[PDB]
Write a protein that binds this ligand. Structure first.
Ligand code: BCL
Ligand code: BCL
Ligand code: BCL
Ligand SMILES: CC[C@H]1c2cc3[nH]c4c(c3C)C(=O)[C@H](C(=O)OC)c4c3nc(cc4[nH]c(cc(n2)[C@@H]1C)c(C(C)=O)c4C)[C@@H](C)[C@@H]3CCC(=O)OC/C=C(/C)CCC[C@H](C)CCC[C@H](C)CCCC(C)C
Ligand SMILES: COC1=C(OC)C(=O)C(C/C=C(\C)CC/C=C(\C)CC/C=C(/C)CC/C=C(/C)CC/C=C(/C)CC/C=C(\C)CC/C=C(\C)CCC=C(C)C)=C(C)C1=O
Ligand SMILES: CCCCCC/C=C\CCCCCCCCCC(=O)O[C@H](COC(=O)CCCCCCCCCCCCCCC)COP(=O)(O)OC[C@@H](O)CO
Ligand SMILES: COC(C)(C)C/C=C/C(C)=C/C=C/C(C=O)=C/C=C/C(C)=C/C=C/C=C(C)/C=C/C=C(C)/C=C/C1=C(C)C[C@@H](O)CC1(C)C
Ligand SMILES: COC(C)(C)C/C=C/C(C)=C/C=C/C(C=O)=C/C=C/C(C)=C/C=C/C=C(C)/C=C/C=C(C)/C=C/C1=C(C)C[C@@H](O)CC1(C)C
Ligand SMILES: COC(C)(C)C/C=C/C(C)=C/C=C/C(C=O)=C/C=C/C(C)=C/C=C/C=C(C)/C=C/C=C(C)/C=C/C1=C(C)C[C@@H](O)CC1(C)C
Ligand SMILES: COC(C)(C)C/C=C/C(C)=C/C=C/C(C=O)=C/C=C/C(C)=C/C=C/C=C(C)/C=C/C=C(C)/C=C/C1=C(C)C[C@@H](O)CC1(C)C
Ligand SMILES: COC(C)(C)CCC/C(C)=C/C=C/C(C)=C/C=C/C(C)=C/C=C\C=C(C)\C=C\C=C(C)\C=C\C=C(/C)CCCC(C)(C)OC
Ligand SMILES: CCCCCCCCCCCCCCCCCC
Ligand SMILES: CCCCCCCCCCCCCCCCCC
Ligand SMILES: [Fe+3]
Lengths: 265, 20, 320, 273, 40, 44, 44, 44, 44, 44, 44, 40, 44, 40, 40, 40
């Protein structure tokens, strides 16, 4: 069973796989370095040289004649952020100078996405109001959601639901259009919306219950609904606008009220 | 962890249980 | 109060989507479609349509033949009694030919011939299913990652069923077709060859199976936690980096000091899953053919413990 | 602020305990209060592992084994050389894992994410706690826990499994194994599908999710979707861990004997016998 | 249902069927007790 | 007393009650079959 | 009593009842076959 | 010195310190319980 | 001094204190039960 | 020498230093407790 | 005191109470069956 | 309910059902005690 | 003492208190059942 | 709850229920002590 | 809380409850010491 | 805190409580040393 001395076939196979796995780990690290690299200094923003084991840049052939992506060429974020360090150290956090939700700091930060909408495989806009979709309807036994009241994080009724935006590719609700008290229509992600009065257990429970059917959005308060980013073109939302709206709502879990940023103690 | 010592538990297992 | 992205609250229904057109010469999809409301709670409610080309027809026919052979042998083993069938189902088994036949292809039907026939038809079905996944990927212009991942599992399957028995010249080394019988085969295989824990490739395959469970838990949790920012739309995040990709990278960078990309994480997952069965097949193939006692082999390589390292008598005594 | 987009995300807040006291980073690592607790507990556990190893028969990393006290010692705190080291390391590991869960929760809050990752890791933490805390407590002795050794805990697994005849006949063990295998198949499928979508062949462009839906409907007649696949993978992995913990916790406490004899219940069902 | 009258009719039907069910079960349990008592 | 039906739907309550009654009856009958004393099928 | 057919759909109640009754009859016949006293096929 | 409070907040430091003191006291008490010389519960 | 309640929420402090007291009391009672000297249930 | 504070902030430096000191002290005390010669608790 | 019904919905309260009572009663009956003193099915 | 009068209807119905349930349980427990006491 | 109802919501406090009381009562009853001195079901 | 007056009613109800619960527990504990004391 | 009056009330209530708790614990510990001392 | 006066007052309170804590610990340690010394 021995090849030479104490060397055997099983040991040779194990050592070969160990070397292969080291090489695979190096390759996986190279693949993981394609976004956000090279690193930069925390204060001065000086860019680090780059890995000795890096290869060529990766180019993605985009559909719909949108060209090439090249994630290594994505523009680096501006070094000047709207904030000031809590203490002068490389590891200190940044305290936002103004409104973090408006300026895009921390949980409210957004990325510079493409300024055109996502498209279906045939070139139609992917995310559209349910009326503009191709015969897409809400499930008859599911909540209609149209005209339902909307509750904010401060338990105030910001307004009602006036429209539903669906993904034409994935067949999923993506955004709910909310008309507020002032009459402004804003988009709210469906992933921050809790639908009440449609519990599976409650349906299983043999009860006659007049539970209030409404939509609760606890990310942001009723006033903040008046500062949701708007759309450049009606019926169309771009990747950048999607990121803007999602960041604005997601940052509310920290910034809607000051207490949301404080420790439990 | 109990309020006994390991030596006490071992002695109880040996004498009070395994020896009588 | 807070949506947790576990179940879809409101489902969108419409006409069934029949799929993007094929770029090659395909016969045409069989437009048998359905809708399951409860599957739409987790994922997509649409069932179908299906594609049934030459490869699908061959795979279905040969797998039906193999399954019919195994089931009819189960019925014969039960004496054609439905009650005995139900009572002994877990213990029913189509067993390989005994050691006196070696690896001969000519065994009497009741002594192992049906076993060989079922293995042949099952192998044909599995290979045609792999060819079908390859052709389905080719027809859409997609990559061949799924065919290679399936090839790894097929490699383990073929090592278990054909390649290792062929190398040893013994049909009796193969896995029987049965619920409890193939578990018994697993246990006996570990027992005769020392202890399969000390097979380094079995340990590697366990490492990769554990790591795949870890990776899916982490990746699914990260994606669902990023649903507020469109994390599950991974194709667009890979080709146009959004705040979901940035947050996903930064979470794990702040947790463990390093991170992947939205594409690199799927490479990690694919490699862990593939390496599980690759190392498993390698370890099984060398067992008996190369190494007959894995505990002795571990002793020679200074990683086999003794009683003065750890004595498991107490653990056995507790469990009685 | 190492990554080209990292700086804007490094803000204060989102801590559960400590506030601004430990709200900072050390290199890539966020610390927080639970990072401090994790560092202390993990470093102490590692140092005590090696201190107990230095007192043992060997320093070979394969053969190092920190063993629990004897079964006769019961649930008492043993002397360090007689299993007390194992107990202190177990407490340190429990504290470190809980602090890791809480630090993950703090980091999730800082990035505006939900608590999916801390809960998912807490499932595995519960599995470990069941293995080395709950099961020994229920069984009445710390000697039922597995040793802290790379190859000796495999010996513990083998001997505990064979103490019940064939551990393959535990039905909860069957369920956990099924979840593990299905998870690995699902991970292979998901990684392969994503990679094939973003790495096309034949000079074609990067695909859309419609292509993934079409591929899996042409393959097996059903596609779960982009959200559904991550939901199902999380479900499979968490179920594998939880049912592993359940299967180990019931063997030796609720069920004692051979797991093969358990399946004699099936043969006694009056429908077929 | 909604009005008291429908609720009262539903209660009447439910109570009648429940009484019939309980009477049948009582006869069966009495026959079993006469056959094999479970309180020695 | 009739007002109970202003809180609980009759259809769902009846379905759940009948499912529970079926489960309970089958459980009791199988338990009786298990016992040697009340087994009514094996012996004369 | 006939008002029951105002709260339960006959088109589903009949199907469920027939399926459950068929399963019950199958189970009872199998249980009887499993006993030596009531097996009507093994002996003359 | 008092200037230590210019870099660390009293409210959070008190919580952290008391958590550490609790864990330390429990560890010391359990260590004492493990020795026959100082165990005060097993024997009189 | 009531100054403490200006910097610590009374509700959170009470919840944490009572959780800690419950865990400590249960631990002490279980430890006392584990010893033959102080067990008050096994023997007369 | 004082210029070390030009490169390391006092807060993180103090936190890391005290974490390390705690770990080292606990390790040394446990090692001493594990030996018969330096165990100060088991015997008189 | 009726005022408690202001703070609790008696529909879900009744459902939960009945579920808990069912679990408790089944547990007690099974425990009584486990004991040889109170088992009422095995012997006469 | 919500009014002090209708919530009293709910309370009296609950108390009546509870009293009947407790009376049945008391009869069963008394019969069991006469049959096989668990104290003494 | 009534001021405690100005800080804690009555419904959640009652639910948590009753859950804790149920767990404590079941634990105590099971512990008593485990002992031979206080077991009330095994022997007369 | 918001006003002290309703909070006083909540407190009165809670205290009455607590007194009843404690009295029942005290009677049960006294009976258990008369049966099998755990001190001595 | 916010005003010194509420802080004073909270501190007084907490102190009174703490003193009652400590006194009960002291009585229990004195009884246990008279029963089974742990020093000697 | 933020100003030297407030920081010094915080230090005074903290040091008073710390001195009380250390004095209690010292009394306990003296009692234990008189009971069972761990040196010599
Ligand atoms: C033979 C040894 C002696 C003994 C020798 C000494 C010596 C010497 C000392 C003490 C001191 C203490 N002893 Mg003593 N002590 C003994 C036995 C006991 C027993 C017992 C059950 O028998 C108890 C309850 C105590 C209690 C105490 C504490 C009041 C005090 C702990 C220090 C402190 O305040 O910081 C702890 C700081 C905290 C903030 C604790 C907070 C606790 C909270 C309420 C609990 C929450 C934690 C967790 C969630 C709950 C428990 C979890 C698990 C138990 C881990 N001792 C035996 C009888 N003890 C020390 C002292 O007086 O210092 C002031 C001291 O120097
Ligand atoms: C007593 C039991 C032994 C033991 C004996 C064995 C034996 C023997 C083997 C393993 C193998 C493995 N063991 Mg082991 N193993 C032990 C204890 C463990 C423990 C533990 C205690 O925690 C763990 C985690 C493991 C883990 C593992 C896995 C890592 C590995 C198989 C994973 C896999 O890829 O799925 C299984 C995946 C497949 C089998 C691929 C299947 C793909 C094909 C194409 C599917 C066809 C399906 C068909 C079309 C469906 C229709 C069929 C008809 C109905 C008939 N073992 C102990 C030591 N173990 C295997 C291995 O490879 O390791 C070296 C193996 O052969
Ligand atoms: C002879 C051996 C027996 C057998 C006896 C047993 C026994 C005994 C056990 C199992 C258990 C398992 N067996 Mg088995 N098992 C057998 C055969 C098999 C086969 C096979 C193909 O034959 C397979 C696939 C399995 C598979 C399994 C799994 C279901 C399970 C292990 C997974 C798990 O617990 O995850 C759960 C994950 C964890 C417990 C890990 C938690 C991780 C912690 C929280 C984090 C660690 C951090 C770490 C320190 C960080 C350091 C990293 C860096 C240094 C920083 N067994 C045979 C029959 N098996 C175990 C189980 O189910 O219990 C849990 C169990 O105890
Ligand atoms: C769904 C259940 C599954 C699961 C989930 C999973 N694992 C996870 C996560 C998730 C979701 C994380 O978020 C977390 C993570 O952050 O990974 C990067 C993690 C993790 N999974 C890990 C390991 C791991 N998971 C395991 C299992 C599983 N993980 C499951 C099967 C296994 C197995 C099967 O044993 C391993 C070894 C780590 C990589 C990481 C946890 C990081 C952590 O706990 O940080 C603490 C810091 C340390 C330095 C460790 C503590 C040091 C100790 C005090 C000393 C060692 C004590 C130990 C008991 C010695 C014994 C070892 C011997 C057995 C050899
Ligand atoms: C799609 O989104 C996703 C990603 O990127 C976008 C991902 O990267 C990821 C992550 C996945 C990967 C990168 C793939 C690789 C991961 C794998 C194989 C699984 C994990 C296993 C591993 C072995 C990785 C390493 C794990 C660890 C726990 C290492 C931890 C190491 C260290 C040193 C932690 C130190 C930190 C602390 C103790 C807390 C802070 C405290 C301090 C700094 C101490 C301070 C004091 C002093 C004295 C220094 C996922 C899941 C994802 O979904
Ligand atoms: C979540 C679990 C929390 C458990 C309590 C805990 O985790 O205790 C913490 C650490 O315990 C530890 O890791 C060591 C725990 C050892 C257990 C044995 C206490 O940390 P701090 O007092 O803040 O700082 C300690 C100082 O030296 C500053 O560095
Ligand atoms: C180790 O473990 C063992 C072995 C068990 C040993 C140790 C055990 C230990 C340490 C146990 C410790 C226990 C303990 C340590 O404090 C217990 C304390 C219990 C207490 C404080 C119980 C209190 C109960 C109060 C109750 C039920 C009150 C109910 C009130 C109700 C329903 C009121 C409803 C209402 C009414 C009517 C009217 C409405 O208008 C207002 C409203 C209010 C809706
Ligand atoms: C451990 O376990 C062992 C060893 C077994 C020991 C323990 C055993 C234990 C704990 C068992 C507990 C059991 C239990 C605990 O409550 C049972 C309760 C049973 C009950 C309430 C049964 C009730 C039945 C009511 C029925 C069947 C009513 C039917 C009414 C119908 C169908 C009416 C229809 C209608 C009509 C006609 C006309 C329309 O115009 C209006 C309309 C209305 C539509
Ligand atoms: C360890 O474990 C063992 C070994 C078992 C030992 C321990 C055991 C332990 C701890 C057990 C503890 C048990 C316990 C601890 O409280 C039990 C309490 C039970 C209680 C309170 C039961 C109460 C029942 C009340 C019932 C059934 C009321 C029903 C009322 C109904 C259905 C009313 C309906 C209505 C009517 C008619 C008219 C409408 O207009 C209004 C409306 C209202 C809709
Ligand atoms: C190793 O382990 C063993 C072997 C056990 C050995 C070691 C043991 C060790 C180390 C133990 C250490 C213990 C320890 C170390 O500090 C304990 C400290 C306990 C303390 C400080 C307890 C304090 C209790 C205070 C209580 C219960 C106060 C309650 C106040 C209440 C409920 C007040 C409510 C209120 C009222 C009425 C009115 C409102 O207007 C305002 C408001 C305020 C809402
Ligand atoms: C209801 O009744 C009917 C009959 C209608 C249906 C019955 C259906 C039932 C009940 C089926 C039950 C099937 C079960 C329970 C099967 C379980 C199988 C299990 C658990 C198998 C596990 C492992 C099997 C393996 C690994 C098999 C591998 C076999 C291989 C790779 C064989 C290869 C053979 C070859 C290549 C043929 C060579 C032919 C030759 C040598 C002559 O020429 C080259
Ligand atoms: C992102 C945080 C800053 C990283 C700087 C790395 C070099 C300095 C690390 C300081 C660590 C604490 C002080 C020294 C111990
Ligand atoms: C913030 C919550 C952190 C813990 C969440 C639960 C962890 C898993 C428990 C099984
Ligand atoms: Fe993914």
């Amino acid at each position: 069973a021995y090849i030479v001395g104490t060397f055997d076939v099983a040991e040779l196979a194990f050592l070969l796989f160990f070397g292969f796995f080291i090489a695979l780990v190096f390759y996986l690290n190279r693949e993981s370095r394609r976004e956000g690299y090279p690193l930069e200094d925390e204060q001065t923003g000086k860019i680090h040289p780059g890995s000795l084991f890096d290869g060529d840049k990766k180019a993605f052939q985009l559909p719909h004649g949108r060209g090439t992506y090249v994630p290594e060429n994505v523009a680096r974020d501006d070094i000047n952020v709207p904030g000031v360090r809590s203490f002068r150290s490389a590891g200190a956090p940044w305290v936002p100078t103004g409104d973090p939700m408006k300026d895009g700091m921390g949980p409210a930060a957004w990325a510079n996405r493409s300024k055109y909408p996502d498209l279906t495989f045939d070139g139609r806009p992917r995310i559209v109001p349910i009326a503009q979709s191709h015969e897409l309807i809400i499930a008859p036994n599911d909540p209609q959601l149209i005209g339902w009241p909307v509750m904010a994080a401060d338990k105030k009724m910001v307004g009602k639901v006036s429209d539903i935006w669906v993904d034409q590719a994935e067949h999923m609700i993506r955004y709910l259009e909310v008309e507020t008290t002032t009459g402004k229509k804003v988009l709210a992600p469906m992933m921050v919306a809790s639908v009440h009065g449609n519990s599976l257990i409650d349906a299983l429970l043999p009860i006659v219950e007049d539970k209030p059917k409404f939509v609760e959005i606890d990310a942001i308060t009723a006033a903040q609904f008046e500062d949701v980013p708007a759309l450049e073109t009606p019926g169309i939302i771009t990747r950048y606008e999607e990121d803007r709206v999602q960041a604005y709502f997601g940052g509310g879990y920290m910034y809607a009220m000051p207490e949301r940023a404080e420790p439990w103690l | 962890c109990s309020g006994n010592t390991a030596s006490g538990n071992i002695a109880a297992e040996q004498a009070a249980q395994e020896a009588a | 109060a807070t949506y947790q992205n576990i179940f879809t609250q409101v489902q969108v229904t419409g006409p069934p989507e029949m799929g993007v057109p094929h770029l090659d010469g395909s016969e045409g999809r069989v437009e048998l479609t359905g809708h399951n409301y409860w599957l739409g709670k987790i994922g997509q409610a649409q069932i179908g349509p299906i594609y049934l080309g030459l490869l699908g027809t061959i795979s279905l026919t040969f797998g039906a033949a193999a399954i019919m052979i195994i089931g009819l042998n189960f019925w014969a083993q039960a004496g054609w009694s439905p009650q005995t069938f139900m009572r002994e189902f877990f213990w029913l088994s189509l067993d390989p030919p005994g050691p006196e036949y070696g690896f001969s292809p000519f065994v009497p039907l009741n002594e192992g011939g049906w076993f060989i026939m079922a293995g042949a038809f099952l192998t044909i079905a599995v290979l045609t299913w792999w060819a079908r996944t390859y052709t389905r990927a080719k027809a859409l212009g997609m990559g061949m990652h799924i065919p290679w991942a399936f090839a790894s599992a097929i490699w383990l399957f073929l090592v278990l069923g054909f390649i290792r028995p062929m190398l040893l010249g013994d049909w009796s080394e193969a896995v029987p077709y049965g619920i409890f019988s193939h578990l018994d085969w697993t246990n006996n295989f570990s027992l005769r060859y020392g202890n399969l824990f000390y097979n380094p490739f079995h340990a590697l395959s366990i490492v990769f199976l554990y790591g795949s469970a870890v990776l899916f838990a982490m990746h699914g949790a990260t994606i669902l936690a990023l649903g507020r920012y469109g994390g599950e739309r991974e194709i667009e995040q890979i080709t146009d980096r959004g705040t979901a990709a940035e947050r996903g990278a930064l979470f794990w960078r702040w947790v463990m000091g390093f991170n992947a990309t939205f594409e690199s994480i799927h490479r990690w997952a694919w490699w862990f899953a593939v390496l599980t069965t690759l190392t498993g097949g390698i370890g099984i193939l060398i067992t008996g053919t190369v190494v007959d006692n894995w505990y002795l082999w571990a002793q020679e390589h200074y990683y086999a413990p003794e009683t003065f390292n750890y004595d498991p008598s107490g653990a056995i005594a507790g469990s009685t | 602020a190492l990554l080209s987009f990292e700086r804007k995300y490094r803000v204060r807040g989102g801590t559960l305990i400590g506030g601004d006291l430990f709200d900072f980073w050390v290199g890539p690592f966020y610390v927080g209060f639970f990072g401090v607790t994790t560092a202390i507990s993990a470093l102490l556990g590692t140092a005590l592992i090696f201190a107990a190893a230095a007192q043992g028969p060997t320093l070979n990393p394969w053969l190092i084994s920190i063993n629990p006290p004897s079964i006769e010692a019961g649930l008492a705190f043993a002397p360090l050389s007689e299993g007390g080291y194992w107990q202190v390391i177990t407490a340190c590991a429990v504290v470190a894992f809980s602090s890791w869960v809480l630090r993950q929760a703090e980091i999730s809050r800082k990035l505006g994410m939900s608590y999916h990752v801390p809960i998912a890791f807490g499932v595995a933490v519960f599995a470990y706690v069941t293995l080395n805390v709950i099961r020994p407590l229920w069984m009445g002795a710390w000697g039922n826990g597995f040793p802290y050794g790379i190859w000796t805990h495999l010996d513990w697994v083998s001997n505990v499994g064979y103490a019940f005849g064939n551990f393959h006949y535990n039905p909860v063990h069957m369920l956990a194994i099924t979840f593990f295998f299905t998870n690995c198949l699902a991970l292979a499928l998901h990684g392969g599908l994503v990679l094939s979508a973003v790495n096309p062949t034949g000079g074609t462009d990067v695909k859309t999710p419609e292509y993934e839906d079409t591929y899996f409907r042409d393959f097996i007649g059903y596609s779960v979707g982009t959200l559904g696949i991550h939901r199902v993978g999380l479900f499979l992995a968490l179920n594998a861990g939880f049912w592993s913990a359940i299967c180990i916790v019931i063997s030796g406490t609720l069920y004692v004997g051979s797991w093969i004899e358990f399946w004699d219940f099936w043969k006694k069902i009056p429908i077929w016998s | 249902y909604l009005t008291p009258e429908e609720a009262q009719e539903i209660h009447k039907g439910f109570m009648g069927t429940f009484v019939l069910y309980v009477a049948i079960a009582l006869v069966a349990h009495a026959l079993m007790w006469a056959y094999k008592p479970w309180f020695g | 007393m009739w007002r109970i039906w202003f809180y609980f739907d009759i259809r769902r309550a009846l379905v759940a009650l009948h499912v529970g009654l079926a489960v309970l009856a089958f459980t009791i009958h199988f338990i009786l079959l298990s016992t040697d004393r009340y087994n009514w099928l094996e012996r004369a």
